Design a protein around this motif. Structure first.
Motif, PDB file in Angstrom:
ATOM      1  N   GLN A  14       0.839  -1.204   0.000  1.00 13.89           N
ATOM      2  CA  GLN A  14       0.000   0.000   0.000  1.00 13.89           C
ATOM      3  C   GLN A  14       0.878   1.260   0.000  1.00 13.89           C
ATOM      4  O   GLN A  14       0.660   2.165  -0.802  1.00 13.89           O
ATOM      5  CB  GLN A  14      -0.970   0.003   1.194  1.00 13.89           C
ATOM      6  CG  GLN A  14      -1.988  -1.151   1.167  1.00 13.89           C
ATOM      7  CD  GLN A  14      -3.142  -0.929   2.145  1.00 13.89           C
ATOM      8  OE1 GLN A  14      -3.763   0.121   2.188  1.00 13.89           O
ATOM      9  NE2 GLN A  14      -3.501  -1.901   2.951  1.00 13.89           N
ATOM     10  N   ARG A  15       1.911   1.310   0.857  1.00 16.42           N
ATOM     11  CA  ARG A  15       2.864   2.434   0.917  1.00 16.42           C
ATOM     12  C   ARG A  15       3.645   2.580  -0.389  1.00 16.42           C
ATOM     13  O   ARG A  15       3.813   3.692  -0.878  1.00 16.42           O
ATOM     14  CB  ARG A  15       3.818   2.285   2.118  1.00 16.42           C
ATOM     15  CG  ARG A  15       3.092   2.641   3.418  1.00 16.42           C
ATOM     16  CD  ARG A  15       3.980   2.671   4.668  1.00 16.42           C
ATOM     17  NE  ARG A  15       4.267   1.336   5.227  1.00 16.42           N
ATOM     18  CZ  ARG A  15       5.433   0.879   5.649  1.00 16.42           C
ATOM     19  NH1 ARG A  15       6.544   1.537   5.490  1.00 16.42           N
ATOM     20  NH2 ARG A  15       5.499  -0.247   6.293  1.00 16.42           N
ATOM     21  N   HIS A  16       4.093   1.470  -0.976  1.00 17.16           N
ATOM     22  CA  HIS A  16       4.836   1.462  -2.237  1.00 17.16           C
ATOM     23  C   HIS A  16       4.017   1.996  -3.429  1.00 17.16           C
ATOM     24  O   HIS A  16       4.537   2.771  -4.233  1.00 17.16           O
ATOM     25  CB  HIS A  16       5.364   0.041  -2.473  1.00 17.16           C
ATOM     26  CG  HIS A  16       6.152  -0.112  -3.746  1.00 17.16           C
ATOM     27  ND1 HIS A  16       5.650  -0.394  -4.997  1.00 17.16           N
ATOM     28  CD2 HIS A  16       7.481   0.167  -3.902  1.00 17.16           C
ATOM     29  CE1 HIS A  16       6.659  -0.326  -5.877  1.00 17.16           C
ATOM     30  NE2 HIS A  16       7.801   0.017  -5.256  1.00 17.16           N
ATOM     31  N   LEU A  17       2.732   1.628  -3.545  1.00 20.24           N
ATOM     32  CA  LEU A  17       1.871   2.079  -4.653  1.00 20.24           C
ATOM     33  C   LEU A  17       1.144   3.415  -4.394  1.00 20.24           C
ATOM     34  O   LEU A  17       0.711   4.047  -5.354  1.00 20.24           O
ATOM     35  CB  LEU A  17       0.920   0.945  -5.081  1.00 20.24           C
ATOM     36  CG  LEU A  17      -0.128   0.495  -4.046  1.00 20.24           C
ATOM     37  CD1 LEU A  17      -1.421   1.281  -4.197  1.00 20.24           C
ATOM     38  CD2 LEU A  17      -0.475  -0.980  -4.242  1.00 20.24           C
ATOM     39  N   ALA A  18       1.053   3.903  -3.148  1.00 25.54           N
ATOM     40  CA  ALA A  18       0.397   5.181  -2.832  1.00 25.54           C
ATOM     41  C   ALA A  18       1.084   6.377  -3.526  1.00 25.54           C
ATOM     42  O   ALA A  18       0.413   7.273  -4.038  1.00 25.54           O
ATOM     43  CB  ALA A  18       0.379   5.362  -1.309  1.00 25.54           C
TER      44      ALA A  18
END
Lengths: 50, 49, 50
Positions: A14-18
Motif C-alpha cells: 500500500q505504501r509502495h503504490l500510494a
C-alpha cells in the motif's frame, strides 16, 4: 497473529503504490487527451469514407 | 482501441484508497510492528502450553 | 535480524515494481514512435525551410 502478519504484508505494498497517484494522474491526463484525438480522427475518417 | 484509461483509473482508485488507509491506520500499524510476536501467546493458553 | 527484517520489507516492493515491466513495454513502443515522428517532422521542416 495471522491477521496482523497479513496486514504487515499488505501495508508495505500500500505504501509502495500510494506514491504512484501523481504519476498515474499525469499518465491518465495524457492518455485521455490521446483518446480524444483518437475519437476525433475516427469521426473525421468515418465522415470522409462516404 | 487500447481503452486503458479505465485501467489507469482503477489503479488510481486502489492507490488513493491505499493512501487514505495509510493516513487512517499508519499510527496503529507502526505501533503494532515492533511487538507482533506476542499475538501467538494468550494469557490462559500459556498455562495449557 | 535487522538485515533479514529489511530484506523481508524490500521483498513486497521488489515484486510490485518487477510487475511494472509489461505496462512500460507498451509505453516504450508508443514513445519510440513519437520520437520517430518528431525527427520526421524536424527533418521535413529543415529540408523545406532550406
Amino acid at each position: 497473529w495471522q491477521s496482523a502478519r497479513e496486514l504487515l504484508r499488505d501495508w508495505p505494498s500500500q505504501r509502495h503504490l500510494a506514491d504512484r497517484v501523481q504519476p498515474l494522474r499525469m499518465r491518465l491526463s495524457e492518455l485521455e487527451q490521446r483518446l480524444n484525438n483518437q475519437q476525433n480522427a475516427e469521426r473525421l475518417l468515418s465522415e470522409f469514407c462516404k | 482501441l487500447i481503452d486503458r484509461v479505465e485501467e489507469v483509473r482503477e489503479e488510481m482508485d486502489e492507490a488513493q484508497e491505499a493512501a487514505r488507509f495509510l493516513q487512517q491506520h499508519g499510527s496503529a500499524l507502526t505501533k503494532l510492528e515492533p511487538m507482533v510476536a506476542v499475538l501467538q501467546s494468550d494469557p490462559q493458553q500459556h498455562e495449557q502450553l
